[PDB]
Design a protein around this nucleic acid. Structure first.
Ligand SMILES: Nc1ncnc2c1ncn2[C@@H]1O[C@H](COP(=O)(O)OP(=O)(O)OP(O)(O)=S)[C@@H](O)[C@H]1O
Ligand SMILES: Nc1ncnc2c1ncn2[C@@H]1O[C@H](COP(=O)(O)OP(=O)(O)OP(O)(O)=S)[C@@H](O)[C@H]1O
Ligand SMILES: [Mg+2]
Ligand SMILES: [Mg+2]
Lengths: 322, 432, 432, 432, 119
DNA sequence: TTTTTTTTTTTT
DNA sequence: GGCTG
């Protein structure tokens, strides 16, 4: 199939659909739109559950509301025949911004001990020395609009934990907001300054030895040589230290997405970490420390012993899957 | 060393002719190397020649590939270059790489097998081999060397053939000299031997007698009975070997002391094999069931039989056939073919039984055209025998055997030999 | 599961004596479980008895463990209870646990062997087994089973087999002296027995007589009728048991008082079994519907039968054949095989009846050749009794029973015998 | 691949001869490729010879285009190199490229015709064809290829057919004078030949005798066996070739000195071929399995067979029909068609054997209607012989080979001819 | 009263002998109840006996359940207890509950049938 | 689960 | 604020 002509043609077809957004990262092409078949959600007028994925072999449209799933060619044949004509004919035809300052953000180590966010991060049991890698704000939409304007229409004051991300050079290129309130648009709001920014927290703090890669930036604070991808593309390539990285995810043996990521990592021949002999039962290392009384150096003891690679990692995954 | 392998496949005729027939797509990776080898294999299949760089990157690479796959294949093809290396080191390194990759694939396959079998039924991914056939996969992966062994050359392999002749490493001799003088040394390993007697004429007295003789000859015997329980077959074997009448064991004329004494006297002999009797419901056992039974015996009891005796071929079921057929010709022929395939796979002499036609009942002679279930069964059998004791041989405790089909020798040489049946002891004795 | 295994090793005897020989340290863990099992094994080696909790704690106190190991072992020891689980589930579950752990250990060992093999030859461990040992190692993982029972092992089960011949474990008596004489103690479990009725003989009279005789001997009887309703078959049963003539019930000679009195007199006797009569339409009951009926009776009625009597084999339907013919040979052969398979898999005595050949109808003597079902019934039937009713026998209220096929004993011992048939009470009485 | 096409037009010669007539300027492009091809065509029209690179530069200089494209054309002629690719792949790829471009041009033309038809007649173009011409021109694009011959013409190709009569190029002699006489030169290549006989009559004997005779005539013979082992077939061949009876081998009447001496005496002959014996499970090999076997035989050794002896086609499986989906007739017809397709593809003489019906096992005459399994096998076969053995014939060591079907001659001239059969030596001798 | 039914299936024998052949998986809600009954039914089919609490906790661990399903089943198993009552009210209450569940399933099925017909 | 063609086989 | 096969 021809992917780029599908991306070009799909865009115009889905451009007519309302709530049209171009979810284009550095390696994928997706289009978000309201589904034209069902009108998406009747109760929520602002939901766009129709999606187009063009990074595969064939660009396919999938609706998460009415379970419509089709190729772009069938979509064009059924709904846009004038666009379908040229589509098959063209088919036959070919067949950086740096965060220099953080306004209204105060670092946690220079804050007073009676601050309510200090009580929360003490309840999260972060060690004190990591407190100079964390900021706090009350004007998070104002801060984001100071960095990337236009994403927040109204700058209502929201207290959020600032999580600046530095490169190997140590320059801040993105920042993540942890939601202090239980009610929020998102638990982790990642904001980039330029679209090719690194999404791996704390790359500047990597020393010699094995590099442990986790899922949470707060989880990496207990870990020596601990960095954390903030979702995004989850690209192993964009992740450095490929010869010596350690792939640590959250402890969830019955969760299908976690074992899907484990299978993707172990089929790539990577060094994946396994919780199959863990004395603790919590989902993440921070939850293990907070709820099961675990101290960090026991955890530094367990993982190093159970580091796995390749075929022996496969059996570990076979028994950890269920 | 995928790059070197591909480069010397493209740019070396001797290396190609040496290593190509042993190449497989499951050896390189799940990325650019596999796609490049797929292109090369498609070109070689289509044109019977090694492709060039132009054929790879123009005539073949313009195919249904992903952007990432296209870029990887382009980089790998551009990276291919001829390098001067000795054509004894290249072949050995390629052989080592192939062996390592075969072992890796086998390990992954057995891991997947264990993971699948751990799951509960209705999600067990049928057609995937059971946990029992893990060691055979590893053994196959071990023997993945680059040696040319396709068939038996007549002139190039006469030494091994003469070794087989002088050792006679196919014959399993009988305990009866009459059955050895017509088979020229007994039955052969990968063979299907059949008895045809009728109704209540024999056909299990003979099989039990053969099992007893093989047991006395030190062979491991597996008696798979479809029509009789394990206890009754073992009682017939006890009557044969303990020289006690079958009625005496029922009325109670034999004491426990002498029974145990005879059993222990047989035990102390080093020239005694192991006989294992297994019963299956009539019509509920196929060749796959027999293979599962063999694997279970080998794993648990460390029992590898040399003789397999199926009490009745016509009351089994076909593993290949999925829908039962009212046509007895095809079903019985398929059953016999599957049984003979099992025999030649396990190198075990397979004896079975067949039913004769009603016309042959009370007939002084039984021809091969008296076979009842199927005419394809005599075609697949290596040796058939017919029991024709009608009325007078019964009064003289005799049975006449005709030798209807003989693949071990000429069946017209000693067609009849008038075997000495004994139904009380359930055995055959000669008339020497 | 490890907690349960250790707890029932400490607090049980049969479980210990059953699972201890198959218990190894490497099967448990690398933490508290392994240390606890090492303590148990050390105690049982030094003192040949199962340790108690206080003794286990004393051994833990006098042992070389670190702080974390001490805490783990103490917690695990404090977490063991004498709770009572069922033995079969416990043994099966611990067998599965042991097998899974052995498989995991073997897979890890072969992976480590492969990893060591791909290392500089100057630099590798000597103790690690070579790659060629991989197929054997997995075999040792697959050869782990708490109890090995694959078939009947001759010379290894002779003591158990003798207990079968003395205890007549398989025989089911007949309540008729002549039938016990020719069967050497009655019919056997897992068998198909049929009656051949000549012209002028009913097939359901003999079956009802056998059902009544088995009922009087304490056996659970399941009578499956095809051409008759449940009430009619149970009326034949009442005629035989209550001594009331069949026509007397319809006429009304016997009143409710006598009927109820006789029924309660039978109910008082403790030597009486249960009879369950189930009706099925003609051709609407294959030998797979009978399995469902047995499952329903076991689950709901708790009725597990020892005798199953099918009214007529010809009326039944061949599940394998699927298609149904009023009088076709292929169906009768399949029906017989399916019913015998049901009898074998249910360990029950199965009875049925068939009509003899027309020539057999005219001739007082009936030959296996003279049978409507040829090579189909005298091949899948352990016993085939033939019933002859001529004019002279009917005038004397008798029927000539001829033995046409006897897997049990010699067919010619007592072949012909005269039976005292009463057609009114549907009964068979002996003749002096 | 326009660069490759242009480069091999300028430099390669045989490719130019084969591909130039099927070349048009519309097949290449509308840019630099079209201009370069126009220059080449103009030069070849002026001077009836292929131009050179310097000639192309001179033509560009004297015959100029607009510089915009002229730069692209001059940079297009900077990459045409010799690049000695194989001829078959180059021709096939050029044919595929021109076919694809012809399809594209035809689709564009029909689209333009449809667009013109929609336009009002006032302004519609006159050069464009009408809509009624859309189908035929499409056909003109469908039948585009480099095959100058579409079939065989009787009068046009009278030459190149007389060559096939002077040099047979199909006949393979039989080494037996009677078979050559009844065949007029022996069996032909790309044919299916069948020996039909009853069970245990000599079919494998005849096939082994034919294989030995072919081997003595410097032929590569591949014996594929579905029933017998490789050693058994090789023993039959040894008995035929080494003049030693089968009984001698199984009785030890031949020494290793005689065996090795005779084998080396046969090896010293320059008129001896190769005999590879291959074994497959009964019902576990098809035509595609045979093709894979031939490919691996050609790769792993310098072995390309001229004779292929399949032991019995009835015990093979079809490569199209799923297993036991169809009856015997359809499956056997499909297998015969697949085998004949393999024979015509490999240009080899394929011998095989077939069974006769149950009614012909004891008959002195065998007709074509006596064929077992399909009746389409005689239809698909090219030469069928019936082997008949009776008591009188067996008493004289002779058989009654009868012509059932013959596409090589009249079956009535010599229909039945006696043949001496040495079963001990597994040899066919002719009565003289 | 699904919890009572499960509790007296596990901890009582006369109740189990009386009510087991008529129980079905469709009589329980799709939450923890149906999964717990599935575990009990599988254990009874495999071992022909009523499982204990330890057996079910072993069966739960050796099961392919999501985190929510696993937590629900474990909580329901923990909540089970042998409340002493009479074996004449339990049987009739279970029969009433089974009849109500059957009626509910039939009503849902006929509603689905009517919705399917109009398509 | 029936229905219809054709074949091949076998049983009576 | 994303999520398919
Ligand atoms: N308990 C016994 N006592 C004496 N003779 C027996 C006994 N059982 C069988 N026989 C004899 O053994 C022969 C029966 O053959 P078997 O070995 O049982 O096999 P088969 O009965 O021919 O097989 P089918 O299919 O059941 S007819 C007859 O000659 C019987 O007289
Ligand atoms: N191994 C052997 N030893 C001695 N004589 C044999 C042997 N094999 C075959 N014969 C003789 O050769 C005859 C024909 O055998 P083959 O030609 O192999 O038979 P076929 O045509 O393959 O049919 P089958 O396999 O016997 S049904 C036999 O009947 C014997 O007389
Ligand atoms: Mg028998
Ligand atoms: Mg043969």
């Amino acid at each position: 199939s021809i992917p780029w002509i599908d991306n070009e043609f799909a865009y115009r077809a889905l451009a007519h659909l309302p709530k049209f957004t171009q979810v284009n990262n550095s390696s994928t092409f997706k289009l978000r739109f309201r589904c034209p078949v069902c009108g998406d959600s009747k109760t929520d007028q602002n939901k766009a559950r129709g999606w187009y994925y063009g990074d595969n072999n064939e660009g396919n449209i999938h609706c998460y509301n009415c379970n419509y799933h089709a190729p772009i060619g069938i979509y064009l044949k059924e709904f846009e025949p004038d666009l379908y004509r040229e589509y098959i004919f063209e088919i036959r035809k070919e067949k950086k911004k740096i965060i220099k300052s953080l306004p209204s953000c105060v670092r946690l180590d220079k804050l007073a001990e009676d601050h309510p966010i200090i009580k929360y991060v003490k309840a999260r049991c972060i060690p004190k020395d990591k407190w100079k890698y964390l900021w706090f704000t009350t004007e998070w939409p104002k801060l984001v609009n100071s960095i990337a304007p236009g994403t927040y229409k109204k700058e209502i004051s929201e207290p959020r934990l600032v999580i600046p991300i530095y490169n190997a050079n140590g320059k801040a290129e993105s920042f993540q907001g942890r939601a202090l309130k239980k009610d929020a648009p998102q638990k982790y709001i990642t904001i980039e300054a330029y679209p090719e920014a690194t999404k791996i927290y704390g790359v500047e703090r990597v020393k010699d030895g094995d590099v442990y890669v986790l899922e949470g930036p707060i989880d990496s604070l207990f870990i020596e040589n601990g960095i954390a991808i903030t979702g995004g593309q989850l690209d192993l390539e964009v992740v450095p230290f490929k010869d010596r990285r350690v792939w640590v995810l959250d402890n969830e043996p019955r969760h299908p997405d976690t074992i899907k990521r484990m299978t993707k990592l172990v089929d790539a021949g990577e060094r994946v970490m396994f919780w199959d002999k863990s004395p603790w039962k919590s989902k993440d290392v921070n939850d293990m420390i907070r709820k099961e009384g675990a101290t960090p150096e026991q955890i530094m003891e367990y993982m190093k012993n159970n580091i796995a690679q390749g075929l022996m990692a496969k059996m570990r995954l076979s028994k950890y899957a269920k | 060393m995928v790059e070197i392998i591909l480069s010397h496949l493209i740019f070396d005729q001797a290396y190609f002719s040496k290593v190509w027939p042993y190449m497989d797509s499951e050896y390189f990776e799940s990325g650019p190397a596999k796609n490049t080898f797929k292109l090369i294999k498609s070109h070689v299949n289509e044109y019977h020649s090694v492709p060039s760089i132009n054929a790879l990157n123009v005539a073949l690479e313009n195919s249904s590939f992903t952007e990432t796959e296209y870029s990887g294949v382009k980089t790998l093809i551009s990276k291919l270059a001829d390098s001067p290396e000795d054509h004894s080191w290249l072949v050995k390194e390629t052989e080592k790489y192939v062996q390592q990759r075969a072992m890796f694939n086998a390990t992954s396959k057995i891991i997947e097998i264990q993971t699948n079998a751990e799951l509960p039924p209705e999600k067990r991914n049928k057609k995937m081999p059971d946990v029992g056939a893990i060691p055979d996969i590893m053994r196959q992966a071990l023997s993945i060397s680059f040696d040319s062994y396709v068939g038996h050359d007549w002139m190039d392999d006469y030494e091994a053939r003469w070794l087989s002749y002088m050792n006679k490493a196919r014959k399993v001799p009988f305990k009866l000299r009459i059955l050895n003088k017509i088979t020229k040394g007994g039955a052969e390993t990968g063979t299907l031997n059949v008895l045809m007697a009728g109704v209540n004429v024999g056909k299990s007295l003979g099989l039990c007698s053969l099992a007893a003789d093989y047991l006395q000859l030190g062979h491991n015997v597996l008696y798979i009975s479809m029509e009789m329980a394990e206890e009754v077959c073992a009682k017939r074997i006890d009557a044969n070997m303990l020289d006690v009448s079958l009625d005496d064991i029922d009325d109670g004329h034999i004491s426990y002391a002498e029974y145990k004494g005879k059993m222990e006297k047989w035990r102390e002999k080093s020239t005694l094999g192991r006989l294992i009797v297994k019963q299956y419901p009539t019509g509920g056992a196929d060749a796959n069931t027999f293979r599962s039974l063999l694997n279970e015996l080998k794993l648990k009891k460390n029992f590898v039989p040399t003789i397999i005796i199926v009490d009745y071929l016509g009351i089994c079921k076909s593993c290949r056939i999925r829908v039962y057929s009212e046509n007895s010709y095809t079903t019985v022929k398929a059953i016999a073919e599957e049984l003979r395939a099992l025999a030649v796979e396990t190198e075990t002499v397979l004896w079975t039984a067949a039913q004769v036609g009603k016309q042959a009942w009370d007939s002084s002679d039984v021809n091969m055209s008296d076979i009842a279930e199927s005419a394809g069964l005599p075609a697949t059998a290596d040796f058939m025998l017919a029991v024709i004791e009608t009325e007078e041989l019964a009064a003289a405790e005799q049975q006449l055997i005709k030798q209807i089909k003989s693949r071990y020798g000429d069946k017209n040489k000693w067609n009849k030999f008038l075997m000495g049946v004994q139904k009380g002891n359930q055995k055959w004795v000669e008339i020497e």
